[PDB]
Write a protein that binds this ligand. Structure first.
Ligand SMILES: *C(=O)[C@@H](CC)[C@@H](CNS(=O)(=O)c1ccc(C)cc1)C(=O)O
Ligand SMILES: [Ca+2]
Length: 240
């Protein structure tokens, strides 16, 4: 997250860290959202590589013991059947991870609230992106979980030629584009939390940023629209 602030450790209890085995250690690669005690929602592009993955819930500082983390293996990966590695702009960037163990809930570990199916945010709706991704374009991951305010940019505006043009679809949410604040590599898969009717709900799964850089004016960070996939999500959780 470029232009972010350190989140309080109990602000976003549904955020997880998706990590892959690297030698004798584990490395963070993407965010994700805890949606069942044994299920995490993340981006399909985060699990394109044939790596060993684990999820960390109740994580705050990647490089220090926080005293609140639970570490669980990934037992099953279900990517949207329409996802295509070669066309992120086509959409379907979403995947569900079944955890090997059910995690325990507490103030640092909670299920993300999802929007009702079909919900679309009015332009300029208040949202926060969270994650441990690069703090600058071509930078390094954050140690502590970051958050940045990124107001939505509606479809008509985000799909206009000055913004993302045809690359953005109606199954996606755009947010930000101020040139200061944005998602960045390693934030993918994580949540976009938007305040609706007094409750924060996860409306987006972080998907991509411009090839030009993370914080690029009029290239808001783009997210899979969670409210477009509610039936798919329920179908996968029900069938496995
Ligand atoms: C997500 O982090 C996104 C920026 C918000 C990235 C793509 N996701 S990633 O950095 O996890 C991804 C890229 C490519 C590979 C091979 C592995 C990891 C983006 O650049 O748009
Ligand atoms: Ca930690």
């Amino acid at each position: 997250v470029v232009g972010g602030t350190e989140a309080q450790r109990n602000s976003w209890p549904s955020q997880i860290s998706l990590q892959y085995r690297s030698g004798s250690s584990w490395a963070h690669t993407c965010g994700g959202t805890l949606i069942r005690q044994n299920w995490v929602m993340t981006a399909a592009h985060c699990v394109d590589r044939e790596l060993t993955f684990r999820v960390v819930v109740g994580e705050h500082n990647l490089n220090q013991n926080n005293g609140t983390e639970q570490y669980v293996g990934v037992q099953k990966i279900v990517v949207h059947p329409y996802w295509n590695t070669d066309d992120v702009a086509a959409g379907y960037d979403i995947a569900l991870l079944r955890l090997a163990q059910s995690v325990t809930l507490n103030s640092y570990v909670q299920l993300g609230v999802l929007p009702r199916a079909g919900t679309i945010l009015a332009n300029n709706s208040p949202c926060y992106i969270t994650g441990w991704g690069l703090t600058r374009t071509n930078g390094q991951l954050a140690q502590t979980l970051q958050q940045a305010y990124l107001p939505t940019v509606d479809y008509a505006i985000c799909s206009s030629s000055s913004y993302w043009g045809s690359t953005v679809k109606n199954s996606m949410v755009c947010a930000g584009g101020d040139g200061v604040r944005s998602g960045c590599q390693g934030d993918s898969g994580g949540p976009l939390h938007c305040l609706v009717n007094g409750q924060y709900a996860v409306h987006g799964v972080t998907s991509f940023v411009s090839r030009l850089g993370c914080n690029v004016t009029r290239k808001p960070t783009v997210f899979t629209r969670v409210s477009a996939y509610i039936s798919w999500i329920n179908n996968v959780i029900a069938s496995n």
